Amino acid sequence: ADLEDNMETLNDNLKVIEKADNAAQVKDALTKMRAAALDAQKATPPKLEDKSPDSPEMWHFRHGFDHLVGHIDDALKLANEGKVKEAQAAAEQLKCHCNHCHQHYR
Amino acid sequence: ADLEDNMETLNDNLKVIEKADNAAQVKDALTKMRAAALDAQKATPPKLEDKSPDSPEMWHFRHGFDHLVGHIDDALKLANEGKVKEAQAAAEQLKCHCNHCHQHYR
Ligand code: HEC
Ligand code: HEC
Ligand code: NI
Ligand code: NI
């Protein structure tokens, strides 16, 4: 999927998690976010096509997705323990990853 | 100074930036936070007291300070350009760095 569709998936499912109140709902939404983040994890974005793959800017951009995926994974483990509210709080903290990357590279 | 000292310094001065009576207080606070972050990077957090310097948890702990310092430096450049409102806006987003590392290790 393209970058815009992946970002919409991340956007909407964050709210699905906030609206949820059980572990299955939160796990399902986090799983969709994980797939969306991985889909976008490798491609050079438009403001960065004039940069090497190992350039500091590309490195930080790719790190942004790797780290987002890591914390999605951590929230999933919470949901898989039935820790609904802790998983929701972890999901809310994902917004930091969103805004950090956007401020750098959007 | 120890890790508790550094964290008090980070907490007090982040609040100074939020409440600064004048623009000059923002730069002075950022300067103190930068020093505190680099000092904290050389500590071992209680929850990782077991781990050797080479452990994956200690790597991510140290890295969070490098990344915090990078964004402090971004905010300092803004302040040194006279863009003091932009610098205060950037400093507010430093809270995400606090929250992220704490989620792992506080
Ligand atoms: C970089 C490592 C990013 C992370 C982490 C997140 N996003 Fe993102 N986002 C990124 C880019 C480069 C862009 C712009 C792409 C372009 O070509 O313009 C975006 C855009 C969005 C959007 C706007 C969608 C649109 O139709 O234009 C949204 C709504 C969005 N991103 C949401 C979002 C969320 C919720 C994230 C965290 C959970 C998130 N993004 C992370 C780069 C990066
Ligand atoms: C890791 C990379 C961290 C970053 C970035 C920040 N903090 Fe932190 N903080 C961290 C740890 C491992 C701990 C526990 C230390 C301990 O001895 O238990 C803390 C703790 C704090 C505290 C409580 C301190 C105390 O005396 O118990 C505060 C008030 C605090 N941290 C504030 C703080 C702020 C405001 C930060 C961003 C500017 C910040 N920390 C970043 C690890 C990390
Ligand atoms: Ni992390
Ligand atoms: Ni950054």
UniProtKB/Swiss-Prot annotation, chains A, B:
Binding annotation for heme b: M7
Specify the domain of life of the species encoding this protein: Bacteria
Segments of skewed composition (Basic and acidic residues): 47-60
- State one molecular function term (GO): electron transfer activity
Q: Which GO terms describe its biological process?
A: electron transport chain
- Alphabetized UniProt keyword annotations: Electron transport, Heme, Iron, Metal-binding, Periplasm, Signal, Transport
Report whether Signal shows up as a keyword of the record. yes
Q: How is the cofactor bound?
A: Binds 1 heme b (iron(II)-protoporphyrin IX) group per molecule.
A GO cellular component entry from the record = periplasmic space
Subcellular localization(s) per the UniProt record: Periplasm
Q: Give positions of region: Disordered.
A: 38-60
> What cofactor does its activity depend on?
heme b
- Family membership: Belongs to the cytochrome b562 family.
Say what the protein does.
Electron-transport protein of unknown function.
The record's note on quaternary structure and interaction partners says: Monomer.
Q: What is this protein called?
A: Soluble cytochrome b562
Tell me what gene encodes this: cybC
